[PDB]
Design brief:
Layout (H helix, E strand, L loop, with lengths): L1 H8 L4 H10 L2 H10 L14 H20 L4 H13 L15 H23 L10 H9 L1 E5 L5 H12 L9 E12 L2 H4 L7 E7 L5 H7 L19 E3 L3 H5 L10 E10 L3 E4 L15 E4 L1 E5 L5 E3 L2 E3 L4 E3 L10 E3 L1 E4 L5 E12 L1
Helix pairs in contact: 4-5, 4-6, 6-10
The chain binds ligand 09L.
The ligand O=C(c1cc(Cc2n[nH]c(=O)c3ccccc23)ccc1F)N1CCN(C(=O)C2CC2)CC1 binds next to helix 6, strand 3, strand 4 and helix 11.
Length: about 350
């Protein structure tokens, strides 16, 4: 009876144990990378180094350069086939495909960010064979990030549940989400680094792949690699947030097969927003004193329904029309918020979500 054993040994809380086991699962990372077409046979994850990953970003940048110069053939070939040599893919018998659009570049970046976090993960979960500490306690300490499970009958749980449900977007109707459990997050250093002074502090969503949480929790949400192609970033190399739960939960890349994902809530010090109506990867240089970028959506939660939780505005839904319509092109469906310094972020809650397909 695991409840009794836990109580006599006074071991880590069982809910934390299950969370740690889930995010530190190396087999799950192997499966995820195989689904991303990375060749785990030819370049095992255990032998991945950060120099290897950086050389990938570098080849990706050369690919970006080719696309930018309208060059296809020799310079590109030298570029694309060279990326693939550095970051082995498994295309079976098929011609390895060219990388030629923004979105193909984006997919490769997501692959390299994931690899980066797995490289962190595999190091983090190294245990001392002879230590008297349970392996999970060793992993948890190495995160340098407190995770405390919350009472489901609490007010904190009720509001986060309403946030989750009420801001599930109408266009993301392929699944619903069931909140399985909720943890408070306290990452070492974040409270003292945080820009408390800035106005417009909101509690906002961030979704990521299951492979990435060990990285995110141990190192924080980070500014993208300097050598990553800028075109991979709709509003530049910042930290991206949604006020709609499902816009962020789409970035969990959950599926019917792997229906358990995590969502992060963080306090985000937006300060004054520079509001933009469409994509600009150079958005960071447009701030000119302002503190964040707001990519303006067609539908957003409205202020009439906001609530505040320990000093951060929680933008409860439902979402309604914003009167915003780019005349120049394709407007966003929902908002996104970007900050360009980790000191504008304080992680606060981690939700374990079941996706109902
Ligand atoms: O926030 C993003 C990010 C996410 C996305 C996709 C995304 N992912 N997840 C979301 O919840 C989200 C919300 C609104 C808009 C986009 C998203 C796109 C570009 C980005 F720079 N980061 C890039 C990846 N991150 C990292 O720590 C890796 C190491 C650099 C965290 C910060």
């Amino acid at each position: 009876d695991l409840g009794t054993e836990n109580l006599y040994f006074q071991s880590m809380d069982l809910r934390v144990q299950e969370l740690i086991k889930l995010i530190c699962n190396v087999q799950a990372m192997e499966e995820m990378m195989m689904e991303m077409k990375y060749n785990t046979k030819k370049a095992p994850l255990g032998k991945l180094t950060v120099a290897q990953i950086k050389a990938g970003y570098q080849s990706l940048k050369k690919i970006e350069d080719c696309i930018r110069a309208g060059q296809h053939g020799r310079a590109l070939m030298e570029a694309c086939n060279e990326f693939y040599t550095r970051i082995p893919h498994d295309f079976g018998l098929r011609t390895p495909p060219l990388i030629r659009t923004q979105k193909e570049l984006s997919e490769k970046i997501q692959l390299l960010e994931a690899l980066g976090d797995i490289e962190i993960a595999i190091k983090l979960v190294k245990t001392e064979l002879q230590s008297p500490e349970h392996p999970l306690d060793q992993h948890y300490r190495n995160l340098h990030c407190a995770l405390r499970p919350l009472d489901h009958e609490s007010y904190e749980f009720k509001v986060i549940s309403q946030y989750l449900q009420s801001t599930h977007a109408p266009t993301h109707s392929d699944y619903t989400m069931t909140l399985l459990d909720l943890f408070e997050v306290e990452k070492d250093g974040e409270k003292e680094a945080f820009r408390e002074d800035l106005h417009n502090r909101m509690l906002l969503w961030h979704g990521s792949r299951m492979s990435n949480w060990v990285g995110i929790l141990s190192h924080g949400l980070r500014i993208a690699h300097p050598e990553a192609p800028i075109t991979g970033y709709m509003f530049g190399k910042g930290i991206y947030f949604a006020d709609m739960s499902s816009k962020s939960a789409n970035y969990c890349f959950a599926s019917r097969l792997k229906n358990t994902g995590l969502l992060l809530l963080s306090e985000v010090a937006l300060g004054q927003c520079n509001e933009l109506l469409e994509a600009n990867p150079k958005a960071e240089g447009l701030l000119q004193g302002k503190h964040s970028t707001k990519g303006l959506g067609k539908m957003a939660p409205s202020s009439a329904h906001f609530v505040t939780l320990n000093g951060s505005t929680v933008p409860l839904g439902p979402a309604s029309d914003t009167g915003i319509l780019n005349p120049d092109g394709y407007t966003l469906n929902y908002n996104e918020y970007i900050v360009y310094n980790p000191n504008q972020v304080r992680m606060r809650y981690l939700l374990k979500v079941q996706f109902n397909f």
